[PDB]
What does this fold into?
Amino acid sequence: KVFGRCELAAAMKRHGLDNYRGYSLGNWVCAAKFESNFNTQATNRNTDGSTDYGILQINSRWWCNDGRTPGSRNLCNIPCSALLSSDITASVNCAKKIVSDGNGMNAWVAWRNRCKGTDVQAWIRGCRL
Ligand SMILES: [Cl-]
Ligand SMILES: [Cl-]
Ligand SMILES: [Cl-]
Ligand SMILES: [Cl-]
Ligand SMILES: [Cl-]
Ligand SMILES: [Cl-]
Ligand SMILES: [Cl-]
Ligand SMILES: [Cl-]
Ligand SMILES: [Cl-]
Ligand SMILES: [Cl-]
Ligand code: NA
It folds into this structure.
């Protein structure tokens, strides 16, 4: 599924990401934009051989099992394919674990390089939330 911007904002709010660990909703929308272009089916291979999955590009090195990432953990205890669903529940629940792991949203490279330090409220402007 390719989400609309406000559609995704509302789904993320319903799932409790607004101000989760202090990160306002616009941070999460901004991250999703630059990670996946709001597309739940997005996949991208990393240099290390791991793959990133879904709307928040969650990595198979640490977080999900894709059967082809040696020496990898599965700390969200999920198959990586579950992160491609039109239902973002698995992605959100796994993201809550990631952001709680010590480095906040710096775990998402695109957030650090494209969203951090910017006016992230712009990403939810206009949305009925
Ligand atoms: Cl929308
Ligand atoms: Cl957009
Ligand atoms: Cl914030
Ligand atoms: Cl915001
Ligand atoms: Cl497997
Ligand atoms: Cl694996
Ligand atoms: Cl393969
Ligand atoms: Cl694991
Ligand atoms: Cl959902
Ligand atoms: Cl933090
Ligand atoms: Na893994």
About this structure: Residues 11, 87-89 surround chloride ion (ligand 9) (CB under 6 Å).
